[model samples]
Target: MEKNFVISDPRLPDNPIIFASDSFLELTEYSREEILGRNCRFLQGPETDQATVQKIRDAIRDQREITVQLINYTKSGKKFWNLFHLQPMRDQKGELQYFIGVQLDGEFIPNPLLGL
Candidate 1:
């Protein structure tokens, strides 16, 4: 019941973004070109909740792994629950390289399932 979604590392030059097999392009309505190098925040519009954004930012600042259910929109204005799993990766020299984010579709699941 799980699908694979893989994308190339955007931070890498000349690399194409890859989505896992269970990826649904229609959900975001964004072509590979449009999303490359763009922060996932671009998907947020006027409707996005600020608290969720703050949580993500805080997690980044704290250098901690966070898994949260966020309300996000696609390029075509479609709304869905984005299950964000973010982990910060560091290089050999102890420098922050990039944050790995895995987004999952959480539309059908109930809020109660989130255990919030």
Candidate 2:
């Protein structure tokens, strides 16, 4: 199966990316060490839209779920459209401690490989 997951810590400054799956690494060319303790915005590049970024920021600040087709760049600056979504999540202790974001290719199709 194509690995897919992501997690972030709301307590961390800038909501640092705490984890992401191997498929995410493959798609972004980002090492786990490099991705940790940093905003996912590192993927943005010259072509990234500030307006779109602002929308996500607004949603985060409001602690509300939001979905958007955000364009992003890879480590090499290759652009791609993502069906990105973010939501607040509470853990087993019922603490709303983090936010999780899920990213899917704009053109993704369900298949066994991904277990979509």
Identify the candidate with maximal lDDT. 2
Clashing pairs in 1: 4-20, 4-21, 5-20, 6-18, 6-19, 6-20, 7-18, 8-18
Give one digit per residue, the lDDT tens place, for model 2 in 24-100.
98888888777888888887777666777899989988888998776678888788877787899887997779888
lDDT tens per residue, model 1, 1-116:
55423343535654334443335345577776677654567778776778788998888778789988777887768788887787877889977666667778866457666445
Residue pairs whose backbone atoms clash in candidate 2: none
In order of appearance, the predictions have TM-scores of 0.71, 0.82
* Alpha-carbon RMSD to native, per candidate: 4.6, 6.4
Each model's lDDT: 0.67, 0.79
* Clash counts for the predictions, in order: 8, 0
User: For candidate 1, which ten residues in a row score worst on lDDT?
Assistant: 15-24
- Candidate 2 lowest-lDDT run of ten: 107-116
Error of 1 at 4 (Å): 6.5
Give the C-alpha lDDT of model 2: 0.79
